[PDB]
Amino acid sequence: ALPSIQLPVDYNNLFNEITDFLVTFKQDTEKGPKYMAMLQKVANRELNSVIIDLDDILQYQNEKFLQGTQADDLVSAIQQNANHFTELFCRAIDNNMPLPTKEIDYKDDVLDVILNQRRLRNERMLFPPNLTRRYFLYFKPLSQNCARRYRKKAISSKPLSVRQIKGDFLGQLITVRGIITRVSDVKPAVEVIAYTCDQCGYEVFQEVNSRTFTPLSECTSEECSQNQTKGQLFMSTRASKFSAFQECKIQELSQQVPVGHIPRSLNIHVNGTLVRSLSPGDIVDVTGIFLPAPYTGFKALKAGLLTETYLEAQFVRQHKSLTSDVEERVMELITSGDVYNRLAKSIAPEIYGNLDVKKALLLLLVGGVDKRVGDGMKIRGDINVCLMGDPGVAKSQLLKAICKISPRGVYTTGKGSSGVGLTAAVMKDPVTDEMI
């Protein structure tokens, strides 16, 4: 049948150490445990996310080493395998959840009403725990500073590329540096599905751990055990638990591509409160778990043993107003004096000359009055500046440079691409094949 192999890791001692770390850990630098404070904060319906730090876990390991008792190197176990430790930590959080200390505040929560209505009928006359959960659990990659402080090296936070991601890193926690190109809308993904049964017993719950599932449509309760054909199950959306899901694509930076090659791309999946952290056009450093997609359905047979892949995201590090500060900056620049000439001159300091052109580009940067006259008359305040002249006079640096100053600007060129008049009403977007 299925042969058996011996592996060093045992999850019992790991669970014991997680339970010890949640209670014992204190920030050495409020007093007391670091995480039981934020758990109490969560219990008051205020915090929606729980973020664990592996620097903190190393701190607990270092405390135990100061005591001298052996440890299970939890930080390495998390790095090598992280899809199971999420469930372990969720169970550990569920076991030690503090009581609501203040402001219970039950107002109109449908799930709350359902759960409260369950109690009376069940007691007067076991469900999946994830239904009662609200917090989301994320890991935080290691820090080189803390690592160098205690050696031990580091692998999870190293800024790899899309190309350096081999098949040997699957099932681990790694970090990838790139630029975000495409981001999709937020849609709900089912986690626990509740079926209502023709006043037969009560609603049944099923968990979904894949991208594809099958409805139950058969009532198995004790009262529903009667033989008469009676009808299948109907889904109830209100008693079911959903989640926010988003998918993005990250592309390799031009600096890291070798000569003669084409850049690759990677897929990122994000669930929870971390959704909407990434937008198109951002250069970011994303940490997560690298997992194999099932690739099932059609065109799975031809591949046979070939799989897709994706990255479950858990952390985001983006590389890069009226206040008294900006109220004083303008006064400082006024006291500086020579605003006109200096403003014109500092525009593209590489190019020497054409100072009147630089004066005019300033006037183009500012806008004239747009006054809406009655009876339909309108007058424009925008500026139309054309610059003619012989080739090789710095024609096309001046322009590019002006685009930098104003955020709202587009550099459109000749017939290589059609963007000036592309006010088209048809868009064959591959995702859905409908017009935009």
Binding site: L2, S4, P8, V9, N81, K166, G260, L306, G416, S417
Partner: protein, 633 residues
């Protein structure tokens, strides 16, 4: 069974007979071991050795014959013995968290003489199946790298033990076995739920490349043929399209071949593939003798003249163009500047001239002598064929991009012939590549910027049959001004009738046409066929071409000169003198001439093997550009 163990014993004896392989195993092992111990690191060598078939031939003729003739029954026994030896060497323990599950077995590679097993994608037939072969060719297409599952590990609740399932495929192993459905087990033998534990399983990278025959060796009236090679593990991404490669592997059949439930048909045959063991590129490593000779030849005063004259010794004259080509070979230093800009370091040359003036025989020479070169013809090219094309990956199913001529020659040269005969829609694309050195693709949901840093040498003809001196230069050249501004040196060459020139050039041509290759008799036709013997062993003064290639490589990779003030003083005076004069030049002078002087000075500085730009470099650049623009020679 018994034969397997006997062959393992034979290979084990072979391994301790020759101690070199045992030393290489230890070197790799100690490197990998002491690399992981460097916590303050500044990467991992694969488990693969290269053995020579020759030594095995003297050791055991039977085993060598078995490997060459019946690889599928002699390679797996050898790999197990190599793994056993490697395991015996590693005395230090490695109680790693997850390396215990994945052993990464050692593999083998071959070299030496293959005899009659050295073939090409055309001479490979059904007689060579299940044999060890080597094929020479050019890579055309590659597939995307995907991960493939080899072993899955599952954890069982209520018991605490693990269970593993193994997977095999036709392309994975050399022996046919019962296939696997690649579905993860969900139920234990006792019915306990099983949970898949990624991070303990095994995945291997997989790629497929296509190798085509060299078009120069094809028979008359026939198109070149191609074959498919599958690469795995550590052989991935060692080749790129356009490369010339030699792949050693096992020629194998696959599938059912239409002898099955499907209808009987004469059009259905079997599918053939190669499981590559080794890939060899057909970078010239330099010894100390070569470097010492280069440094000794650098100090000679008239080195630029010798280097320029050594180019194309079968062309009479055209000294200045040959100097310009040499300066192209040793490009300038590229400067990365703020606002996301870069000053180009490439030198671009255009040649306009009369018919039969040896314009096209210099492009062919540049194709051969340079490290990377791509040939293009004006009328037989398209815009989508120069920048990139949207295609599909059959093996995996996505939509991808395929490189064109310009982007395939990154850090190389592109030689375009009949440049004026190119259509306008075609000529816009080359404009962008000449200006930004980048390609923008925004088609079919693929939004990408591609790097293309190539040097352009081009040849064209005037509007009429021959150059006219009684008409303005712009009337003679049909090319637009915007395109014409992007060339550093424009050379107008004219054939003038003179008796002494004719007497010399006719003598040179007649001397050239009377050359006999060594080993050929008079009247014996040249047998440019090689008789299917592709290779014997499978892996005033002028200078020889390979020495020139070594010189160019060393100069490009070892010296980066910087500009100096005293050279700038010469450059500025030359620029000011040239700008303010009434001489009628064949091309207008603009503010981009200064950059051309700087680039030519940098190239001449590289030629001298020096780290600074001197006054002599500025003088040489000035003389070259004065000849180009004026003809004052």
């Amino acid at each position: 069974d018994a034969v397997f163990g006997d062959r393992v014993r034979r290979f084990q004896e072979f391994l301790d007979t020759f101690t070199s392989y045992r030393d290489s195993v230890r070197s790799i092992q100690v490197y990998n071991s002491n690399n992981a111990a460097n916590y303050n690191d500044d990467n991992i060598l694969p488990h693969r050795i290269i053995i020579s078939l020759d030594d095995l031939r003297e050791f055991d003729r039977s085993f060598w014959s078995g490997i060459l003739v019946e690889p599928a029954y002699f390679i797996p026994p050898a790999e197990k013995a190599l793994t056993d030896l490697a395991d015996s060497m590693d005395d230090v323990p490695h109680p790693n968290a997850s390396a215990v599950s994945s052993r990464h077995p050692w593999k083998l590679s071959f070299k030496g003489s293959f005899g009659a097993h050295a073939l090409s994608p055309r001479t490979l037939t059904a007689q060579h199946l299940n044999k060890l072969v080597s094929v020479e060719g050019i890579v055309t297409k590659t597939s995307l790298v995907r991960p493939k599952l080899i072993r899955s590990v599952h954890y069982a609740a209520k018991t605490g033990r693990f269970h593993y399932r193994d997977y095999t495929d036709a392309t994975t192993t050399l022996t046919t076995r019962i296939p696997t459905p690649a579905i993860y087990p969900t139920e234990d033998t006792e019915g306990n739920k099983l949970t898949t534990e990624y991070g303990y399983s095994t995945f291997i990278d997989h790629q497929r490349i296509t190798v085509q025959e060299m078009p120069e060796m094809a028979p008359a009236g026939q198109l070149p043929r191609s074959i498919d090679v599958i690469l795995d593990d550590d052989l991935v991404d060692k080749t790129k399209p356009g490369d010339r490669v030699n792949v050693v592997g096992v020629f194998k059949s696959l599938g059912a071949g239409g002898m099955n439930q499907s209808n009987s048909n004469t059009l259905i045959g079997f599918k053939t593939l190669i499981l590559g063991n080794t890939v060899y590129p057909l970078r010239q490593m330099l010894t100390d003798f070569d470097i010492r000779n280069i440094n000794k030849l650098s100090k000679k005063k008239d080195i630029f003249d010798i280097l320029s004259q050594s180019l194309a010794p079968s062309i009479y004259g055209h000294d200045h163009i040959k100097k310009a080509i040499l300066l192209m070979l040793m490009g300038g230093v590229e400067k990365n500047l703020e606002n996301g800009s870069h000053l180009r370091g490439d030198i671009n040359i255009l040649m306009v001239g009369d018919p039969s003036t040896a314009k096209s025989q210099l492009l062919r020479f540049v194709l051969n002598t340079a490290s990377l070169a791509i040939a293009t013809t004006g009328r037989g090219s398209s815009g989508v064929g120069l920048t990139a094309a949207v295609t599909t990956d059959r093996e995996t199913g996505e939509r991808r991009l395929e490189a064109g001529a310009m982007v395939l020659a990154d850090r190389g040269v592109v030689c375009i012939d009949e440049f004026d005969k190119m259509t306008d829609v075609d000529r816009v694309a080359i404009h962008e590549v000449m200006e930004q050195q980048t390609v923008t693709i925004a088609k079919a949901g693929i939004h990408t910027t591609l790097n293309a840093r190539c040097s352009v040498i081009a040849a064209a003809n005037p509007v009429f049959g021959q150059y006219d001196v009684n008409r303005d230069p712009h009337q003679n050249i049909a090319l637009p001004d915007s395109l014409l501004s992007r060339f550093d040196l424009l050379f107008v060459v004219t054939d003038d009738i003179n008796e002494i020139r004719d007497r010399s050039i006719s003598e040179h041509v007649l001397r050239t046409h009377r050359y006999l290759p060594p080993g050929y008799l008079e009247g014996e036709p040249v047998r440019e066929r090689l008789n299917l013997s592709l290779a014997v062993g499978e892996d005033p003064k002028l200078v020889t071409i390979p020495f020139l290639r070594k010189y160019v490589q060393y100069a490009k990779e070892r010296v980066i000169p910087q500009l100096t003030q005293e050279a700038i003083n010469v450059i500025v005076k030359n620029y000011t003198d040239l700008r303010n004069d009434d001489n009628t030049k064949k091309s207008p002078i603009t503010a981009r001439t200064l950059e051309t002087l700087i680039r030519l000075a940098t190239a001449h500085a590289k030629v001298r093997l020096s780290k600074t730009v001197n006054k002599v470099d500025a003088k040489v650049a000035a003389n070259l550009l004065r000849f180009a623009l004026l003809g004052e020679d």
